[PDB]
Amino acid sequence: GSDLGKKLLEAARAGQDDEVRILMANGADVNAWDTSGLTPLHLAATFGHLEIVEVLLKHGADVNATDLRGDTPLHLAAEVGHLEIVEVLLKHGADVNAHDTFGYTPLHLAALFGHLEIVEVLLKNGADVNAQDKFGKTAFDISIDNGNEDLAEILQKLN
């Protein structure tokens, strides 16, 4: 979406709440992709900009939009440890079991990052614990290899 598309991506990365609003009204494309296929949603999800995530979604952003590595905004919020954003995406129809080009599910990424509360909300929302990445690893395997005892207990109940 030309100049508006690049400006919208910049404002979602920077967390310029009021600038995102100004650009939407002017017609900036909500799913305007960057060099790596990241939409303003992915950028807000990485950097932890909760309000921007909510404004983008109310302005019809694609909750399951996949970048070029195949990561949706749910994979990114789970990796970056943004619990509140993981809750907002889930409530707005995010794919709990979405798979990137490496076979990672959001649970794979939350377990590797050691985000205990995110793992709890992902499992509550139906994340498959038996999913295997292209390395043949489940999220339980990730926690045991990392040496994360508290997380392996949290995942063993289902796996």
Partner: protein, 425 residues
């Protein structure tokens, strides 16, 4: 015979490399077919440093062209000097590195690395007396960054007795392709600290600033930035290419410019800052000015450990001497007192294209810590949130590698601070 083997890796590496070859071929009188057509014997005296002598009076760059992206082959080959390169010196992959250091260093790059080394070996073994290696690459991408540093470490183990010199393009958000650039650059700096003898820090932040703030160029292309890179590259290699008593080979340059093995990152500078005649005092003042540095660091914030200055053209050599000593006497506080006579000047009669007089600056300054601090702060902002970490761990990398690269760049910053505060007891 003091031969240099030139390597160009990735998109940036091949673009700045091609521009270096076009610029130095014009200075040496070499046309795109490899034929000489100049008016001076000084042009051919040290031609062997960068060119191999070919059949029927022809000259061929001692250059190896590398990329994981195949489309790079085509763009170079289509350039004005595209035909000058040896076809068997093009080593190109087919899948690309996707701006990922891990892909360049451990996956796609690891698969192509042996093929490059075979070409390096062939060029090196034909040299009468190899000086060392010159590599062009960016630190922000995947191929130049990841594969370039893998190439450096493999050349270092095979040729430990030869100089390793790099022209390394530092990323900047002002000129940015992706947010993963701080990761790619930090992982690379770690490798450069350990495996190169001397590195020219070509900062995209400084290039952007010079273009817009010095020439008022509102929309710089990579071509606009590369005009500054090619002018600098020509200038810093002047004493290697043209008959000259001072800074004859890369080893002699490294010996006098590098007091501590890890502190080998130079801040290049150039005057006058033109676009696509100054007096000796004007050239001298411009050369030491923050606005003329190719690294976005204020020299005034640090101290020079060593300085090399190369003047090009027909000028009063008495005026050069007086002007150079004047800078040191009037601004004594910007040079460490514990390295006596640490400012060296050389004069070459041949000026660069479209200029009657020019000056090239090579500074080994503690102020370069500002560039490393900038990258480190961006790396830390990204790494704390673990953003895009799966791209790297998915290629087999461990998070400890990131922690280690971060610690070693911060150790490099503190080392520069240590010598900036050191007193001549």
């Amino acid at each position: 015979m003091r031969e240099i083997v030139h390597i160009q890796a990735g998109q940036c590496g091949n673009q700045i490399g091609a521009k270096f070859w076009e610029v130095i071929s014009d200075e040496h009188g070499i046309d795109p077919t490899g034929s000489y057509h100049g008016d001076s014997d000084l042009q051919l005296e040290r031609i062997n440093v960068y060119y191999n002598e070919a059949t029927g009076n022809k000259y061929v760059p001692r250059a190896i062209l590398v990329d994981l992206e195949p489309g790079t082959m085509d763009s170079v080959r289509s350039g004005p000097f595209g035909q000058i390169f040896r076809p068997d010196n093009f080593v190109f992959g087919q899948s690309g590195a996707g701006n990922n250091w891990a892909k360049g260093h451990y996956t796609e790059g690891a698969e192509l690395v042996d093929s490059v080394l075979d070409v390096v070996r062939k060029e090196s073994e034909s040299c009468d007396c190899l000086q060392g290696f010159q590599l062009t690459h960016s630190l922000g991408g995947g191929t130049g960054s990841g594969m370039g540093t893998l190439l450096i470490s493999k050349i270092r183990e095979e040729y430990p007795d030869r100089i390793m010199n790099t022209f390394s393009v530092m990323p900047s958000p002002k000129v940015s392709d992706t947010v993963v650039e701080p990761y790619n650059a930090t992982l690379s700096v770690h490798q450069l600290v350990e495996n190169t003898d001397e590195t020219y820090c070509i900062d995209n932040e400084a290039l952007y600033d010079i273009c817009f703030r010095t020439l008022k160029l509102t929309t710089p292309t990579y071509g606009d930035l590369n005009h500054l890179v090619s002018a600098t590259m020509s200038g810093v290699t002047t004493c290697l290419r043209f008959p000259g008593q001072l800074n004859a080979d890369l080893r002699k340059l490294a010996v006098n410019m590098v007091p501590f093995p890890r502190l080998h990152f130079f801040m290049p500078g150039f005057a006058p800052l033109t676009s696509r005649a100054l007096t000796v005092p004007e050239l001298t003042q411009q050369m030491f000015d923050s606005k003329n540095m190719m690294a976005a660091c204020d020299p005034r914030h640090g101290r020079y450990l060593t300085v090399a200055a190369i003047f090009r053209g027909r000028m009063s050599m008495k005026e050069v001497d007086e002007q150079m000593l004047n800078v040191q006497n009037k601004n004594s506080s910007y040079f460490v007192e514990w390295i006596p006579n640490n400012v060296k000047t050389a004069v070459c009669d041949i000026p660069p294209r479209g200029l009657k007089m020019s000056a090239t600056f090579i500074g080994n300054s503690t102020a370069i810590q500002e560039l490393f601090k900038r990258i480190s702060e961006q790396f830390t902002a990204m790494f704390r949130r673990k953003a895009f970490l799966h791209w790297y761990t998915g290629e087999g990398m461990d998070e400890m590698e990131f922690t280690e690269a971060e610690s070693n760049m911060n150790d490099l910053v503190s080392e520069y601070q240590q010598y900036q505060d050191a007193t001549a007891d």
